[PDB]
Amino acid sequence: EFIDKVSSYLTPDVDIAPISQGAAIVFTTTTHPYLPRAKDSHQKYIIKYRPRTLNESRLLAKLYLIPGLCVPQLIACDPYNGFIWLEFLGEDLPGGHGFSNLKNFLWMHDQDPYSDLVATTLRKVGRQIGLLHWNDYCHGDLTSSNIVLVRDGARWTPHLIDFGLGSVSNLVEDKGVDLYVLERAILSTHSKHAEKYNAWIMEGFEEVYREQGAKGAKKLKEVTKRFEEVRLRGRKR
Amino acid sequence: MVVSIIPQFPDIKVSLALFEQVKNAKEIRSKMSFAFIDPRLVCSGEQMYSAIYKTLIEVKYNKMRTRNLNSECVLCLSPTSNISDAFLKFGIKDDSSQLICLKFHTDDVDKEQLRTIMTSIVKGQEIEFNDDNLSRFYDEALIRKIYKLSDDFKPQDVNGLSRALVDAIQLR
Numbered sequence A: 001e002f003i004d005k006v007s008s009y010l011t012p013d014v015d016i017a018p019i020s021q022g023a024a025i026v027f028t029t030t031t032h033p034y035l036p037r038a039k040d041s042h043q044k045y046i047i048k049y050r051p052r053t054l055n056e057s058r059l060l061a062k063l064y065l066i067p068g069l070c071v072p073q074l075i076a077c078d079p080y081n082g083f084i085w086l087e088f089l090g091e092d093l094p095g096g097h098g099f100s101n102l103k104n105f106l107w108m109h110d111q112d113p114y115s116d117l118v119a120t121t122l123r124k125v126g127r128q129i130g131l132l133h134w135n136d137y138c139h140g141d142l143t144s145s146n147i148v149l150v151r152d153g154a155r156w157t158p159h160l161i162d163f164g165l166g167s168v169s170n171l172v173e174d175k176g177v178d179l180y181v182l183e184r185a186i187l188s189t190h191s192k193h194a195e196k197y198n199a200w201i202m203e204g205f206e207e208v209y210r211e212q213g214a215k216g217a218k219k220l221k222e223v224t225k226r227f228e229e230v231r232l233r234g235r236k237r
Numbered sequence B: 001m002v003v004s005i006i007p008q009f010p011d012i013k014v015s016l017a018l019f020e021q022v023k024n025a026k027e028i029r030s031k032m033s034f035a036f037i038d039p040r041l042v043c044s045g046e047q048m049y050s051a052i053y054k055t056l057i058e059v060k061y062n063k064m065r066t067r068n069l070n071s072e073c074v075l076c077l078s079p080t081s082n083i084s085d086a087f088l089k090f091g092i093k094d095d096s097s098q099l100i101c102l103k104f105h106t107d108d109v110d111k112e113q114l115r116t117i118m119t120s121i122v123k124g125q126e127i128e129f130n131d132d133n134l135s136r137f138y139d140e141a142l143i144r145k146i147y148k149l150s151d152d153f154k155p156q157d158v159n160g161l162s163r164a165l166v167d168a169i170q171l172r
C-alpha cells in the first residue's frame, strides 16, 4: 500500500526502486525532482518517505554550511506529505562486498586491516564526528551503517547520513552517548580488530579538538571524561 | 527561452526567458501575467527550478499566499515569508539591466505568441536561459546579504553557492 501511495504521489513519470524500510521507507530514482530532464548532474537520487522530516532537513542544511562537514545534499522537501529528496552517496564495493557504508568496508578488509587505506579512512570518520560535536550537534543514531564512504580516486571520504534523531546540543552527555553508540556498533561484529578500529576513529576525533588550541584541549578533556563514564554506566554493575 | 515541467506536476508548464541590456525596467514596473525577476539574486537553474518546485508543493498541499503562481514563485525564491520584502528584493528594480521573465501555464504553449508578448513588454536582448548566462549576472555579495550566509561559508564554485540557496528555499 505504501508503494501505491508513493507512486501515485510522484506520478508514473518518476521511476522508483525501494532499497530500505525501517520503523521511513527509502527509494532510489533516476529522476531529478525539478531540473529539466538531462540538465541534472547525477545518475540517481534518494527519496526518503515517512508514512521529523522537517528536523532532518533542517539539520542537513545547517551542517552543509560548516566547513569540513560531509553530508548529503538536501535536494527537495515536502513536509506536508513527508518526502525528502537527497543526493545518493556511495557505491557498490567491488567483489560483491556490498554498499560502501563503513560496516561493509570494515567487513571487506577485516582479514587484513593494517594498511594506510584502512587507518586513514577510519581517522577521517573520527574527524567527521569531531567536527559534528565541536559545533554542538548530536547525531542520535551513530552506527556503522550511517557512515557512508564516497570514493575519491584511491581514497574514501566518509559522509554522515540519517539525521532523523539528530539535534543541536552543547551537552557533553549527548556527545559521550554518540561516541558510545558507535563504539558498541563497531564492537558488535566481534571482530578481533574492532578495538583497533575504534582507536583509529578516536584519533581522528581528538585531532579535530586539538586543532582548536587550548580551548579545544579543555573541551576534549571534558568529552573524553564523560565518554569514559558512559562506558562504565553502559554495562552491568 | 525554455519551457519546462516539474515531474510530479505533469500538466503545468513554466516558461523562462533571460534578457540583457534591458532599457525599460522602470516602465515595466509601473505597468505591473508574468513574474519579472532580478537575476542579480539568481545564480543557477538549479536554484530557480527549486523555487518552482516549492511553489507547486505549497499551492497544492498547503496555502497560496499571493495572487497567482507567478507571484507565489517570487515569494518562494526568498528565505523568509514577508511577501512585500520578497517582491522588492527578488523582483526587478528601476535600475535593472537584466531580467528573468517567468510564466506558469496551467494545452501546449504557443511559443511564437509568447515571444511576441515578451518582446512587446521588454526593451532588451534575449539570450539563452542557461547556467553559462546566469553566471554572468548574479551578485554573490548581495546574495550573501539577502540569504543571510555567514562569511565562514566559502563554496569553491557556483554549485556550492547554489546548494545553500536551494536549502534556504526548501526550508522557508
Ligand SMILES: Nc1ncnc2c1ncn2[C@@H]1O[C@H](COP(=O)(O)O)[C@@H](O)[C@H]1O
Pocket: A019, A020, A022, A024, A026, A046, A048, A072, A086, A087, A088, A089, A090, A099, A145, A146, A161, A162, A163
Ligand atoms: N543519501 C543516501 N545515499 C545513499 N544511500 C542512502 C542515503 N540515505 C539513505 N540511504 C540508504 O537507506 C538506508 C536507510 O536510510 P535512513 O532511513 O536514513 O536510515 C541507509 O542505511 C542507506 O543504505
